[PDB]
């Protein structure tokens, strides 16, 4: 059905690097140059206080909407990824349901400033204290620590492209019908990533990448905190949370 569902030559792996990087550049949501430029645009003490005084439900709704916006770009990235549209719809859904949030969490390191420990949120940079009204301090600091750890690797845009492609194309996701097809696509995407690292003398980052359990822990924590919020404000979730967010994190 697709070339990358079988064994690929060196020239075909080189083509895969270019294709993945193109798919990412076209769906990256915000340009790295735009994020870097806005690092000096930091929320004032008054602005931080304003976010802290928002209700728990209002903050959750705002955050769920922004995360939904980010996920939609991840869906477009998947659609443009070599071989993804050749998989059956069950498997496309399985991969996006398990991997969409993982991709957003990786992409977020671009929007994280390791120098002052701030993240780009609603037009400016703010520290983790900006999210205090959510009532999920552990989850927030775990996301900030993850972004700090990824930022220390000094990822290029091409590295984020290849790595996120691998985060999404995971043959171990429970529920995959055509597991062997996914395994071969994963193998080729692994070769594309490792080829690019070899070519750019960046193989030293391989031993520095987070273990797969790390992204799983973050997603499980997210689902857990959402459940706590849902019990407290069920109508807020039912009436005002984005439909896509609900389909991915609370089974519709």
């Amino acid at each position: 059905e697709n070339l990358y569902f079988q064994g690929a030559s060196l020239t075909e792996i080189e083509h895969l690097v270019q294709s993945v990087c193109k798919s990412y550049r076209e769906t990256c949501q915000l340009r790295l140059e735009d994020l870097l430029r806005q690092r000096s645009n930091i929320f004032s003490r008054e602005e931080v206080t304003g976010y802290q005084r928002k209700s728990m439900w209002e903050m959750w709704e705002r955050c769920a909407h922004h995360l939904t916006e980010a996920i939609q770009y991840v869906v477009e990235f998947a659609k443009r990824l070599s071989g993804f549209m050749e998989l059956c719809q069950n498997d496309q859904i399985v991969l996006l349901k398990a991997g969409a949030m993982e991709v957003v969490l990786v992409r977020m390191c671009r929007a994280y400033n390791a120098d002052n420990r701030t993240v780009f949120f609603e037009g400016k940079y703010g520290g983790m204290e900006l999210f205090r009204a959510l009532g999920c301090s552990e989850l927030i600091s775990s996301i900030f620590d993850f972004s700090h750890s990824l930022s220390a690797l000094h990822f290029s845009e091409d590295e984020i492209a290849l790595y996120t492609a691998l985060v999404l194309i995971n043959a171990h996701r429970p529920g995959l019908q055509e597991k062997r097809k996914v395994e071969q696509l994963q193998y080729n995407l692994e070769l594309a990533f490792h080829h690019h690292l070899c070519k750019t003398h960046r193989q030293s980052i391989l031993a520095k990448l987070p273990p797969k359990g790390k992204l799983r822990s973050l997603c499980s924590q997210h689902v857990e905190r959402l459940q706590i919020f849902q019990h407290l404000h069920p109508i807020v979730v039912q009436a005002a949370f984005p439909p896509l967010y609900k389909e991915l994190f609370s089974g519709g």
Partner: peptide, 10 residues
């Protein structure tokens, strides 16, 4: 529902 729609919309 949404994911199905997003994947079908070309």
């Amino acid at each position: 529902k949404i994911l199905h729609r997003l994947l079908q919309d070309s």
